[PDB]
Amino acid sequence: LVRGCWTKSYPPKPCFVR
């Protein structure tokens, strides 16, 4: 599902469209 999210981790990465 396409929605705006982002993962705070290392490496830091915007979420995936799943």
Residues 6+ apart with CB under 8 A from 7: 13, 14, 15
As beta bridge partners, residue 6 has: 14
Q: Are 7 and 13 in contact (CB under 8 A)?
A: yes
Please give the Cα distance from 18 to 2 (Å, whole number): 7
Please give the Cα distance from 11 to 1 (Å, whole number): 22
How was this structure determined? It was done by: NMR
Q: Which H or E run contains 7? A: strand 6-7
Residues 6+ apart with CB under 8 A from 9: none
Q: Please name the residue that has the structure tokens 């396409």.
A: 2
Which tokens hold the place of 15? Answer: 């979420």
